[PDB]
């Protein structure tokens, strides 16, 4: 039979989660964005389509800061990216609150990872319609 693709946490007979695969289509459809690691830091850039002269330039900022030392950029469904960055902010506050030091980047990565994965565990949520490129400088 079929219908494997109608519901989020469902494994298809070949072991795939189709809804996640469809989320990836939403990403591919989005604006292009990149990150480049350099010898002492990271650089993030994004393409911002101008739909009309009417958009105030410089104004609809897309890159987001998490804590003081982390930058995030994403392609796809933008509101999804925001939601993910909100969570990243709570998640980093929590870490700083308890451990005093600002969150290490690999630690931070995993926090976002676990939250995103969480949204492929149940059919009462949809997966995230973004890929996120993010990074920073930490203790090492």
């Amino acid at each position: 039979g079929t219908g494997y693709d109608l519901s989020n946490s469902v494994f298809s007979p070949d072991g795939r989660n189709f809804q996640v695969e469809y989320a990836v289509k939403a990403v591919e459809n989005g604006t292009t964005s990149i990150g480049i690691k350099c010898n002492d830091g990271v650089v993030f850039a994004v393409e911002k389509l101008i739909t009309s002269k009417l958009l105030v330039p410089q104004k609809n900022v897309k890159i987001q800061v998490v804590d003081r030392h982390i930058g995030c950029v994403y392609s796809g469904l933008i509101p999804d990216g925001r939601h993910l960055v909100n969570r990243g902010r709570e998640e980093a506050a929590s870490f700083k609150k308890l451990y005093k030091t600002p969150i290490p980047i690999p630690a931070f990565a995993d926090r976002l990872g676990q939250y995103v994965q969480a949204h492929t565990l149940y059919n009462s949520v949809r997966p995230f319609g973004v890929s996120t490129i993010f990074g920073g400088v930490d203790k090492n």
Binding site: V61, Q64, V65, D67, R68, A93
Partner: protein, 233 residues
């Protein structure tokens, strides 16, 4: 409901013609034991605000961490963070005041007296007080705990009403403050000689002075005082 354990004594402050001055000594007392000597109780937020805190030090450290967090948060999705949408002293004050009042209302206070000193974006001087009850007030001079008894009367001789503010120079003001710290060191048993002072000036910006010392103390007359009435030698 709690009781303060490690405490900081007075925070004193006044406004002059261009800005505001605020000072506090570097002591953390533990009852009558003068326990800790390296304690900074002036908290600068941005470059236009200094929050000076007395009372319970563990609570001060909590408020410290709240203020770091406010900076982080205001910077989020804000491309005018370091310009028109930076934190004003009035924002920082009204936030703290909110916290302090909600905390007393839950019968679990932050055991502090706080003075927020700064310069607004239109150049106006900001000086307001908030304590553990959530009580707030402004005046051309403001001091906490012991300082309200001994600094205010000295500082009020210099600025005594609003109209005295344009007449007062940073030299005259800082002198008045420095003198008040010496008086407090003479008569407050919970005070230290070492202190920090900060000026927030609409032209010069923020000057933060650390490791000051009460200088120029009169003790000589002590040699002529003997006994407690009839004793001659």
């Amino acid at each position: 409901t709690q009781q303060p354990i490690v405490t900081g004594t007075s925070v004193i402050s006044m406004k002059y013609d261009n800005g505001v001055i605020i000072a506090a000594d570097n002591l953390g007392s533990y009852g009558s034991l003068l326990r800790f000597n390296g304690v900074e109780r002036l908290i600068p937020v941005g470059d236009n605000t200094v929050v000076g805190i007395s009372g319970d030090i563990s609570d001060m450290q909590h408020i410290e961490r709240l203020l770091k967090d406010l900076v982080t948060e205001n910077a989020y999705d804000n491309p005018l963070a370091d310009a028109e949408e930076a934190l004003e002293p009035s924002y920082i004050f009204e936030y703290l005041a909110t916290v302090m009042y909600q905390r007393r209302s839950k019968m679990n206070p932050l055991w502090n007296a706080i003075i927020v000193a700064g310069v607004q974006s239109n150049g106006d001087q900001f000086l307001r007080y908030v304590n553990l009850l959530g009580v707030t007030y402004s005046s051309p001079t403001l001091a906490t705990g012991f300082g309200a008894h001994m600094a205010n009367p000295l500082l009020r001789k210099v600025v005594d009403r609003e109209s005295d503010i344009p007449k007062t120079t940073v030299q005259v003001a800082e002198e008045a403050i420095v003198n008040a710290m010496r008086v407090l060191y003479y008569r407050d048993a919970r005070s230290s000689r070492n202190f920090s002072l900060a000026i927030i000036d609409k032209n010069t910006g923020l000057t933060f002075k650390k490791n000051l010392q009460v200088e120029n103390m009169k003790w000589d007359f002590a040699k002529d005082i003997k006994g407690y009435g009839t004793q001659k030698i």
